[PDB]
Amino acid sequence: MQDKQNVEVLHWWTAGGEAAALDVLKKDLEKKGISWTDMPVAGGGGTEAMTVLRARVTAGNAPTAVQMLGFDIRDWAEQGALGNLDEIANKEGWEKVIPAPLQEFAKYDGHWIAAPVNVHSTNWMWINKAALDKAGGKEPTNWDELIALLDKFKEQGITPIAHGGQPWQDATIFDAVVLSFGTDFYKKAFIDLDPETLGSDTMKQAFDRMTKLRSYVDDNFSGRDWNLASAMVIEGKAGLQFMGDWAKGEFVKAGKKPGEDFVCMRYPGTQGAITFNSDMFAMFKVSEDKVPAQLEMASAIESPTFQSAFNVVKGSAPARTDVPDTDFDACGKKAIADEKEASEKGTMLGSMAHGYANPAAVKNAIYDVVTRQFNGQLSSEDAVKELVSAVEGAK
Template sequence: MTVLALVATACGDDSDDETADEASTQEPAATAPSAEEPSDDASAPATEPDSSDDETTAEDSSPQVSGTVEVFSWWTSGGEAAALDALFATLTAIQPNIEIVNAAIAGGGGSSARAVLQTRLGGGDPPDTWQTHHGAEILGQYAAAGFTTGLDALYREQGWYELIPAGLIEALSHNGDPQMVLAGVHRGNGFWYNKTLLDGQGVSVGDTLSVDQFLSIAADLDAAGIDALCVGDNGIWASAELFENTLVGVIGPQAYLGLWDGSTSFESPEVKNAISIYSQFLDYQNDDHVALSWDQAVSKVIDGSCAFNSMGDWAFGEFLNANLEEGVDFGWVSHPGSHGAFVAVTDGFTLAVGAPNPDATIEWLKAIGSLEGQTAFNQLKGSICARTDCDRGDFGRYHNWAMDSFGSAVIVPTVVHGSAAPAAFQQALNDAITVFVVSRDVDALASELAAAARASGFGG
């Protein structure tokens, strides 16, 4: 599958972790420098840029354009909205005569927005630009259907082929032509916790967390009357993400990759073991999970009413928006067992075929891809720059940790956010998880996922 072009490893420090040992045998395709030793390698996001007095900014190089641009997204939570506003501010600074129409639709993971978008596209009423993800989503749902305009000329004009890792570009290109401009790269397998709460319970989280370690901590917290795991799955994708992260953590990134090329079966003993462990995680979730959105679940970690949350690093934006200090009020670690992996969730925007305002939309895409735009956006969103010349000094502890993970871990695609598999499989996963949260039938979930994989043309 095309999306697997994004898969990349880089050799890091020696580790006795089995998945890290497996990753070290592969050829690095995307690396990131350490926070302590910046590198001029241009193969991964966020390195120390060269300084130059005659550096040309996006504002310097763009002639003035007027008009409107309708920006369609699902970024409505506090942290998401703040990051989106930073992109709007970048565009306004470059092109003050462009009017921005914020067409965001609430619903985590795009669960509501994508249905509205599909109706508009099918009816010949596209927004100028919409939020999407790399891999199967942009390529299968939009590019192959003729809804997106190729951006090769823009990439060449802006020098992005030299500034964005080749694996990322390949994973969003149709017939060699990029179909979207990336704003940032999220790490989907984060495990966030209220540090003050855990300190009060005498719990210390190290650099990594195993499944057994988490289950032991969870049992102790449960005995103390504390919800160990916050979940907000009124949009079922959040529980599906908990499953996805658990799957990566239990079977390892290489076997997880095998799910999408058929070399790992969803009915294998290792996958069934992962499903069983996912069920154990659910034993420790908050009772009101069905009533909450993903960001409301993060808010429960923020206010100390539960301990952990498994979520991509868009959660970082919620902590930041609540004025919490990283490493002091809240902490993070990879989802249990998954520290050898980086579950890549990219955010980017398109140029619609038939966009009502193509010139203004091109200026919007330039702002997204600019150094200024990516720095401002990712500082607030929690993701790392897609560009390789962002200054690591402009980012804090979490971002630098994520940059190092991008350079040293096995990069794997997310199915929950549309990259690893076709939309039909994504929907089948959500439907199966909805049933499993109640039934806890391991064999049934494995069988349903295997059947969906076969129906989607891969694995089983």
């Protein structure tokens, strides 16, 4: 009669687009007789959710299912805190359809310990179509063209860059800025954590670009939620936003269409590469009674029909490679094709900002340097020195 199974889910999907996509999963589970106890922890990018999580686990109160990124997953797998999903994954044939870069994180010590939802990526620009057309309509391909477009936006009297001053958002931009100096440089810096690279003249140029981008954000940017920056571009109050494709979730929620109302492009100099992050659900070992629901949730997440429906709304690519792009809009189709290509070419690189490039300690030490340099507290020359010391001290 009434539902007899239930999942208690900690996640940070609280903005309108994110909430819309999550509704897809909730409805899916409900049809299976599984109700939902919602434990949302608001805060873009999940830092706040992870803080709540740590205190809860220390208190012997781990949630049944937890939204999680990258090296964070590994950290709990190492501790043996996560449920083994093998019996679902082996039987459902996950090995054949989940890209190897995601399996590095979804698997630990020979076992599936998370169910990957999607493949977001961070190196996008969201451009207001009306403002672009006012600016002559040319999509910027390189750095100089980007600056020329931002200058036109500025003379149009709008805020050229919609941005929120929070360390993770600053890092999100820096993903793409570093990426624009080439995939080799990005790997050397954020994946290999090579100190010569991190201290290079090229990294000094990257910070100089952040200074330039800083000059085009509005004076009230500090502390603004990412989705409120997205809204500025949606409303035509700002020209463009540099953000992961969760931003598209907002545009679609507002009824805006690719081509007509907005343009979606890779960050100039990064087409042909992606800086990826994959939201996964980790099922924490709790009561033995909860395991059937946990396994059902993992199965639901990896179902082809859900993999399409959820990601269409979310603004990410499916985690499964065998899910067709048919129901995706023009930007979602690009996301999928860019992922297949980057995967083939070895330019599908873990996002630093969103926890796929390096461990939390390193990520956080990078956040601090990037934030202070963007906010103008630190010169590019000094930022380079401090980045090397912070990274070396965190490894």
